[PDB]
Design a protein around this ligand. Structure first.
Ligand SMILES: [Zn+2]
Length: 257
């Protein structure tokens, strides 16, 4: 039932998913002046050299690029994390206009889009078990701004024509996610949730300070995707973002001063 329209969007989610009103929901606004530098944070380690991508899917809500998580090939360690977290998929949230689209906000500023690299804790054995745990996932969030083109994103935009409508998938091998990262690994971190149903409170969020830049032509191709299935009235896949949720009893920590 759920989606991003007037009759099924974020303000309706709580009827099927009561945790939508919970104590550690995501996204949030990051107030930069209230966030605390934490000297206890250890350095962040992104090890993506052996990543194995498999394919790309339009699921009616976004598109997902899916990875082989049957071994430690692409992992996230360090920072706030205890242990090893395996890369399972990435996806994006974006807007109808360049001034909206991100899920997290920085001093109330919305970016054009947000990339989520989703990782699960190998102590739990599989992704479905990990989402039932408070420390089961680590999501690396990266903001996108419209300016220069991102060469490492072009291969993704090149394949979107083949997955226009809900339920379509395609082969997507040999894509290197290192090409989606900014120069700096400086970050904010806090405990939160999945940003789509089932909204489970299982995520350690790691949100990079430095946005990546993409071109207008790249973001326009995201906005050509469809929420509907093939043969149905067209509904463009835009504004598939959940707004900021109450911070409640949480503190956001910074890795940098
Ligand atoms: Zn997401």
């Amino acid at each position: 039932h759920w989606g991003y329209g007037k009759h099924n969007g974020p303000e309706h989610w709580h009827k099927d998913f009561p945790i939508a009103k919970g104590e550690r929901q995501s996204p949030v606004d990051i107030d930069t002046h209230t966030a605390k530098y934490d000297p206890s944070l250890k350095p962040l380690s992104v090890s993506y050299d052996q990543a194995t991508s498999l394919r790309i899917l339009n699921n009616g809500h976004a598109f997902n690029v899916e990875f082989d998580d049957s071994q430690d090939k692409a992992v996230l360690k360090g920072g706030p994390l205890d242990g090893t977290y395996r890369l399972i998929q990435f996806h994006f949230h974006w807007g109808s206009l360049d001034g909206q689209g991100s899920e997290h906000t920085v001093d109330k500023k919305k970016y054009a889009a947000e990339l989520h690299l989703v990782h699960w804790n190998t102590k739990y054995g599989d992704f479905g078990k990990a989402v039932q745990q408070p420390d089961g996932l680590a999501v690396l969030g990266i903001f996108l701004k419209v300016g220069s083109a991102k060469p490492g994103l072009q291969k993704v935009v090149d394949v979107l024509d083949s997955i226009k409508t809900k339920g379509k998938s395609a082969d997507f091998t040999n894509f290197d996610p290192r090409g989606l990262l900014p120069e700096s690994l400086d970050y904010w971190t806090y405990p939160g949730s999945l940003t789509t149903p089932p909204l489970l409170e299982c995520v350690t969020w790691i949100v990079l300070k430095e946005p990546i830049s993409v071109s207008s032509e790249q973001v326009l191709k995201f906005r050509k995707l469809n929420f509907n299935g093939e043969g149905e009235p067209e509904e463009l896949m835009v504004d598939n973002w959940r707004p900021a949720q109450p911070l409640k009893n949480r503190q956001i920590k910074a890795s940098f001063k």
